A paper describes a structure:
Cryo-EM was performed on fibrils assembled from 30 μM IAPP in the same buffer used for kinetic assays (160 mM ammonium acetate, pH 7.4, 1% v/v DMSO), in the absence (4 replicates) or presence (2 replicates each) of 50 μM YX-I-1, canagliflozin, or doxazosin. Fibrils were imaged after 2 weeks, at which point fibril formation was at a steady state, as judged by analyzing aliquots with ThT. Fibrils with a similar morphology were observed for the control (no small molecule) and doxazosin-containing samples, with the majority having a twisted ribbon morphology and crossover distances of 60–100 nm. Following helical reconstruction, multiple distinct IAPP fibril polymorphs were resolved, revealing further detail on the apparent morphological differences between the samples. The majority of fibrils formed in the control (69%) and doxazosin-treated (72%) samples were classified into three related fibril structures (named LL, LLU, and LLUU, respectively), which have a shared structural core consisting of a pair of protofilaments related by a 21-screw symmetry. Each protofilament is formed from a single stack of L-shaped IAPP subunits, with straight β-strand segments encompassing 13ANFLVHSSNNF23 and 25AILSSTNVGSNTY37-NH2, hinging on a turn at Gly24. In addition, further flanking subunits presenting U-shaped IAPP subunit conformations and ambiguous β-strands were observed adhering to these two β-sheets, with the combinations of these flanking subunits differing to generate the three individual polymorphs LL, LLU, and LLUU. Thus, out of the fibril structures that were identified in each data set, YX-I-1 fibrils consisted of 89% C-fold subunits, whereas this subunit fold was absent from fibrils grown in the control or with doxazosin. By contrast, the control and doxazosin-treated samples consisted of L-fold (62% or 72%, respectively), U-fold (34% or 28%), and S-fold (4% or 0%) subunits.
Residue numbers in the entry:
A (entry chain K), B (entry chain N), C (entry chain Q), D (entry chain H), E (entry chain E), F (entry chain B): 14 to 37
G (entry chain P), H (entry chain M), I (entry chain J), J (entry chain G), K (entry chain D), L (entry chain A): 13 to 37
M (entry chain R), N (entry chain O), O (entry chain L), P (entry chain I), Q (entry chain F), R (entry chain C): 14 to 31
The structure:
């Protein structure tokens, strides 16, 4: 069992995450 | 069992995620 | 069993996701 | 069992995460 | 069982995390 | 069982974390 | 008497599961 | 009497699970 | 009498689980 | 009588679990 | 009588767990 | 009578656990 | 004698007699 | 004798008699 | 004799008799 | 004789009789 | 004789009789 | 004879009779 994983990133990455703002 | 995974990214990536704003 | 997965991206990617805004 | 994991990043990465702002 | 993990970063990384601001 | 872990960082890293600001 | 009112009343159990991601580039 | 009112009343159990991420670049 | 009121009343159990991350670059 | 009021009343048990991180660069 | 009031009243048990980190560079 | 009031009243048990760190560079 | 009188009710009025 | 009189109720009024 | 009189209620009024 | 009289209530009023 | 009289209540008023 | 009279209450008033 030979397994290879490769991940190469050369690009700018901008991520925004918002969770919430719920009124109960 | 020989398995190869390759992921190459050269492009700018912008992601926005919003979860919420629910009134109960 | 020889398995190869390749994913190459050279293009700008913009993604917006909104989940919510439900009134109960 | 031979397993290889490689992760190479050459791109600027900006991440913002906000969790909260819930009124009970 | 031969396992190799490699993680190489050459890019500036800025991360902001905010958790809270909940009114009870 | 031969296990190798390598982590090499050559990039500036700025991290900000805020937890709190909850009113009870 | 001028009333501008927005009102919500919930009496039922609510379950919500959300998954966002799992994209390979 | 001028009333501008926003009111929410919840009496039901609420469960929420959110997962964001798991992206490979 | 001019009332500007924002009111929230919760009487129900609430469970919330959030996971953000697990990205490989 | 001019009232500007923001009021919140909670009578229910609340559980919250948050995980942020686990990113490999 | 001009009232500007922000009021919060909590009568319920609250549990909170937060984890931030575990990033490999 | 002009009242500017910020008031908080808590009657419930509160548990909080926070972990920040565990990053390898 | 049970009686409930409500005017301009936007909230929740719950009355239980057992 | 049980009686509930409410005017302009935007909140929650709960009355229980056992 | 049980009686509840409420005016302009935006909060929560709970009355329990056992 | 149980009686509750409330005016302009934005908070929480709890009355329990056992 | 139990009586509760409240005006402009923004806090929490708790009355328990046993 | 139990009586509670409150005006402009922003705090917590607790009265217990046993």
């Amino acid at each position: 069992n030979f397994l290879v994983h490769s991940s190469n990133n050369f690009g700018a990455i901008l991520s925004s995450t918002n969770v919430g703002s719920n009124t109960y």
